[PDB]
Each structure stands twice: as structure tokens, then as C-alpha cells.
Design a protein around this ligand. Structure first.
Ligand SMILES: *[C@@H]1O[C@H](CO)[C@@H](O[C@@H]2O[C@H](CO)[C@@H](O[C@@H]3O[C@H](CO)[C@@H](O)[C@H](O)[C@H]3NC(C)=O)[C@H](O)[C@H]2NC(C)=O)[C@H](O)[C@H]1NC(C)=O
Ligand SMILES: *[C@@H]1O[C@H](CO)[C@@H](O)[C@H](O)[C@H]1NC(C)=O
Ligand SMILES: *[C@@H]1O[C@H](CO)[C@@H](O)[C@H](O)[C@H]1NC(C)=O
Ligand SMILES: c1ccc(CC2CCNCC2)cc1
Ligand SMILES: c1ccc(CC2CCNCC2)cc1
Ligand SMILES: [K+]
Ligand SMILES: [K+]
Length: 498
């Protein structure tokens, strides 16, 4: 529909520039003709989800790389893809003119954009806030009579979520996560630092905290927003650390187990929100499988836990097989979900690198890795940040797929945006990952899935500098002859005739 307006800021690739009168967009989604495939291509050299079509052929000869679809080898069903409506994201979006706001929200939530279907919503303040607050700051209010949503929710986050929902054709799922409780519930009496709930699971402090989750869901429901899932705490390990700089609430895995079993599970289950799913952990993968073992081997906690939420700090190394792999082996019926990912958080790296192809490749490589380890969805962190990677009240700045520049009423779509979109746009909720077998060793990263309507989607990432000729074989349908260019990402889509 409208192509990328590219701009270089001196990094390895370009951003696409959007403003009050222009943004890149797709035509309404349509599948290629039967016997035809669609290819969407992005490249470091500057192509951004460009559409081409080719024939599916009956015949194939040669000893080049062959990737054979395994459509009957079925793995996880996908929940979807999205990002976080933090206070920082909301402030940045709303600092744009009304037209630019609309083009930014369409970029993410419309079918002429990349089709996000998940929004993560912080329960009150986090580091990506400019004010520290909870919903119940009046002290000793154990019945939560003074629970209320402030303007950060009622004027910023809620209106934007409603606007996203109006643009989306896909059903959108909301996920809620708290960073801190009110300080009068905490051992340290502060939003940050090392501190946990006072007392022990099953007591008034823990019961009040569980009730706060229901009050939050009730309050959002009065604004006609319902949640798909909540997490039991954002990064519960952080609040166990001396000097933790921003909002946190510390739980050991045993504390989380007992809080879920005695307070949060029962309280949610006895509420009008009993259909809301509960995800445990919401933290870094090196805590697995240990945390899952602690919580899920207790039947009283296990009956309340629908899934395990994991965070991806893409700047740092950690094992995937020994964490996600082992967790799936031990608890194959408990879904894994990636609830936060970010890059640029190291103090010594530029928070925002406008046009970084490398950071784009980090996003898509992480998404592929997550899907190959049975994870059902992937959620970015802040939907938009300023050029400093903020605002953030402790200056914990990071990168974002969309960077807003209010002095030009402009926003920039980073390589990260397109790398995420190669998955989000083309993998509807309910898609199922299927097998994809390589005929020979190769440098590509790839994943295949089947849509609910039976159609095929394959994503191929080439992080090498070399162009790799390859063929995709769909045993029911025929052969796709293609190339994976160096420093590219492709998404292939086709209809599958019986
Ligand atoms: C929102 O962004 C739009 C896209 O950049 C702006 O529209 C562009 O304005 C340019 C300046 O009038 C037009 O001419 C081109 O400008 C570029 C520099 O940015 C030059 O390199 C080109 O040589 C020049 N081309 C010619 C033939 O003169 C662009 O044609 C025009 N693009 C489109 C798609 O309309 C908007 O002005 C901007 N909106 C606001 C409110 O700032
Ligand atoms: C494909 O395969 C066989 C090879 O023997 C041949 O009969 C057929 O005509 C070929 N089709 C095309 C379109 O090349
Ligand atoms: C359980 O549910 C009932 C309403 O069905 C409610 O009145 C009661 O307070 C709930 N119990 C709690 C919150 O402990
Ligand atoms: C072109 C682009 C994207 C797609 C997939 C979408 C998934 C959500 N429903 C509409 C189709 C198909 C063809
Ligand atoms: C490999 C990569 C991309 C393509 C599609 C081409 C790219 C150039 N513009 C026209 C469409 C084919 C094979
Ligand atoms: K209040
Ligand atoms: K940084």
C-alpha cells in the first residue's frame, strides 16, 4: 500500500520514517493464488516486508538445501504476539499529533500493519513510569475501600487500549502484571529495595494483595476491558536483591507457590474473573526448571497455574535447552509464554540505536528460538519510547521497535519492528507450529506453522553474510524454489490444497 520512507542514522540499516501525513502500510491481507506462494522480505540493505510471489512447482532436482515441511508433526498452538502499554509508551504515543498517534497504533494493531493481538498492562507503576504510585496508597486500607485507578490508567493507558482494540480485526488479549504492592503491605515500607509482603501466605497482608488483583480486574471491567491472563508478580526474584532500584516485590519460589495456593488462586477462582488465566514466574529463564519444580509439584498451587511466563533480556547470554527445554520435558502440559523481551539495557550500550539490523536479528532469532522450545507467544516490552529510550524514573533506558520524536512529530520504525512483524503479522492466534526438516547442515534459522484454516507459514532468518539458495518442500503441495539472502528475513505463506 505505502512503502517505507528510509532514513539512516549511521547504524547498519535504516529506519522507516512516519509522521502526521505518511506511514508505510500494507494492502488488506490476501493469500496468494492456489499453486502460488507469497514472500515478504526484509533486508539489511533496506527492503522492509516487501511482497513478491512465486510458483509452487511440481518438480525439484539438485543437491541444494531442502527444508521439508512436516505438516502432521504438530507442536504448540500459538497464543500470539504483542507488546507492553507502559506509562512511558502511553506518554510517548500521546505526545504525537492525533494523526501520527493513529498511524502508530495502526502500524501495530491493524491488518495494514503487523497484527499484534497481545497487550501487556502493568498494574500501577513500574520503572517505565514518571510517577511512583500504586492503586491503594492510603495506608492500612486492608478492605481496599480507597482502591482506584489514577489518570495514568483512565486518561492514558485505557483510552489507548480501546483505540488499539477498535483498529484490530483479531481478538486482542490483555495480560496484567504488578511490580509492587502498596508499601504498607511490605516488609521494607518502600516501593523499591529488598522487600516482600509482610507475614506469610494465608494472612491479612497476602489476602489483601490477592484482593488487589480482583479490584484491578473489576476496575478495568468497569471500563469494558477484560483480561486473558495475569502474572503472579513481575520479576519476583528482583525484590530479593539488596538495593533493587525500582518497583519490585520479592518472592522465593516457595513464597510464590504458597501465595498462589493459599491466596491468589482461590481469590481469582472465587471471583467473576475466574476465567482469567494465572501465569507464574514472569522472570528470567535461568530460574527454570527449579521454579517450575517448586510451584508445580505442589498440587494445591499447580491446580491454579495455567502457564509459565518468561522474560528475555536479549543483551545477555543464557541457556535455552537446560531451561525452557527441561521445563517442557518435566511439565509438558503447562504452557510456556514469553511475556517481556528487550534490548539496549546495558548501561554502556546506546539505549536506542536507530536502524540497528543486529538488534532486529536479536528479536527474530529470539522469537524463532522461543517457538522451537514450545513457547506459545512473545511479548515485547515498551510499545514506543523516546530517542533516549525513556522516559524512565530511574533512567533505566532501553530500545523499542518504535521511537517517537515529538520535536518533528515523527516516529521511526526500527528493524526490530519488522523482525517482530515477520511473525506477528503472519501467525494468527491458534496457529500450530509444525516440523521443518533440513536436508543438510546450514546457517539459517527457520520455523514453520500451520494456520487454523490449514494454510502454511514459514519464517527464514539468515544472520550470515552469504546468500543461501534453498527449496522448501510441502509434501502435499510441491516445491518453493527461493534464496535466503545474507542478512535477510523472509516470511513465506501459501494455501494447502488437499
Ligand atoms: C511527512 O513525511 C512525508 C514523507 O517524507 C513528507 O512528504 C514528503 O515531502 C517532501 C518535501 O516536500 C517531498 O519531496 C521530496 O523530499 C525529500 C526530502 O525529504 C527529497 O529527498 C526529495 O528530493 C523530494 N522530492 C521531490 C520530487 O521534490 C516528498 O515527495 C513528500 N513525500 C510524500 C510521500 O508525500 C511530509 O511533508 C511530512 N509531513 C509533515 C506534516 O511533516
Ligand atoms: C515434472 O516431472 C516429470 C519428470 O519426469 C515430467 O513428466 C513432468 O512433465 C515435469 N513437469 C514439468 C512442468 O517440468
Ligand atoms: C467468594 O465469593 C462470594 C460471591 O460469590 C463473595 O461474596 C465472597 O466475598 C468471596 N470470598 C472471598 C473474597 O474470600
Ligand atoms: C497476507 C498477509 C497476512 C496474512 C495472515 C492474516 C492473519 C490474520 N487474518 C488475516 C490474514 C495472510 C495474507
Ligand atoms: C530471493 C529474494 C527475494 C525475491 C523477490 C524479489 C526481490 C527483488 N525485487 C523483486 C522481488 C526472490 C528471491
Ligand atoms: K487510590
Ligand atoms: K543502555
Amino acid at each position: 500500500a505505502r512503502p517505507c520512507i528510509p532514513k539512516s542514522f549511521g547504524y547498519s540499516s535504516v529506519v522507516c520514517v512516519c509522521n502526521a501525513t505518511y506511514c508505510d502500510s500494507f494492502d488488506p491481507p490476501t493469500f496468494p493464488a492456489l499453486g502460488t506462494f507469497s514472500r515478504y522480505e526484509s533486508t539489511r540493505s533496506g527492503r522492509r516486508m516487501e511482497l513478491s510471489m512465486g510458483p509452487i512447482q511440481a518438480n525439484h532436482t539438485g543437491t541444494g538445501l531442502l527444508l521439508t515441511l512436516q505438516p502432521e508433526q504438530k507442536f504448540q498452538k500459538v497464543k500470539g504476539f504483542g507488546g507492553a502499554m507502559t506509562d512511558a509508551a502511553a506518554l510517548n504515543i500521546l505526545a504525537l499529533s492525533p494523526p501520527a498517534q493513529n498511524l502508530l497504533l495502526k502500524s501495530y494493531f491493524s491488518e495494514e500493519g503487523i497484527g499484534y493481538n497481545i497487550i501487556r498492562v502493568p498494574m500501577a507503576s513500574c520503572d517505565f513510569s514518571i510517577r511512583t504510585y500504586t492503586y491503594a496508597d492510603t495506608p492500612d486500607d486492608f478492605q481496599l475501600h480507597n482502591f482506584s485507578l489514577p489518570e495514568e490508567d483512565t486518561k492514558l493507558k485505557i483510552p489507548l487500549i480501546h483505540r488499539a482494540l477498535q483498529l484490530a480485526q483479531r481478538p486482542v488479549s490483555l495480560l496484567a502484571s504488578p511490580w509492587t504492592s502498596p508499601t504498607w503491605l511490605k516488609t521494607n515500607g518502600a516501593v523499591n529495595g529488598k522487600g516482600s509482603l509482610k507475614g506469610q501466605p494465608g494472612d491479612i497482608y497476602h489476602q489483601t494483595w490477592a484482593r488487589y488483583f480482583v479490584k484491578f480486574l473489576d476496575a478495568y471491567a468497569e471500563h469494558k476491558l477484560q483480561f486473558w491472563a495475569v502474572t503472579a508478580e513481575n520479576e519476583p526474584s528482583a525484590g530479593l536483591l539488596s538495593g533493587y532500584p525500582f518497583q519490585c516485590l520479592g518472592f522465593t519460589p516457595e513464597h510464590q507457590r504458597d501465595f498462589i495456593a493459599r491466596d491468589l488462586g482461590p481469590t481469582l477462582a472465587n471471583s467473576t474473573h475466574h476465567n482469567v488465566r494465572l501465569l507464574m514466574l514472569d522472570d528470567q529463564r535461568l530460574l527454570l526448571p527449579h521454579w517450575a519444580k517448586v510451584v508445580l509439584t505442589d498440587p494445591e498451587a499447580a491446580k491454579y497455574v495455567h502457564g509459565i511466563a518468561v522474560h528475555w533480556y536479549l543483551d545477555f547470554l543464557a541457556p535455552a535447552k537446560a531451561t525452557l527445554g527441561e521445563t517442557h520435558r518435566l511439565f509438558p502440559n503447562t504452557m510456556l509464554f514469553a511475556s517481556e523481551a528487550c534490548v539496549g539495557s546495558k548501561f554502556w550500550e546506546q539505549s536506542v540505536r536507530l536502524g540497528s539490523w543486529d538488534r532486529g536479528m536479536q528479536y527474530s532469532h529470539s522469537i524463532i528460538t522461543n517457538l522451537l522450545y514450545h513457547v506459545v507467544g512473545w511479548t515485547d516490552w515498551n510499545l514506543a519510547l523516546n530517542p533516549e529510550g525513556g522516559p524512565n524514573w530511574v533512567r533505566n533506558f532501553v530500545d523499542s521497535p518504535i521511537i517517537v520524536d515529538i520535536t518533528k512529530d515523527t516516529f521511526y520504525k526500527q528493524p526490530m519492528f519488522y523482525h517482530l512483524g515477520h511473525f506477528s503479522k503472519f501467525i494468527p492466534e491458534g496457529s500450530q507450529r509444525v516440523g521443518l526438516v533440513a536436508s543438510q547442515k546450514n546457517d539459517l534459522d527457520a520455523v514453520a506453522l500451520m494456520h487454523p484454516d490449514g494454510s502454511a507459514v514459514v519464517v527464514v532468518l539468515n544472520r550470515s553474510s552469504k546468500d543461501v539458495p534453498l527449496t522448501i518442500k510441502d509434501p502435499a503441495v510441491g516445491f518453493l524454489e527461493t534464496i535466503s539472502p545474507g542478512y535477510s528475513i523472509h516470511t513465506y505463506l501459501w494455501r494447502r490444497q488437499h
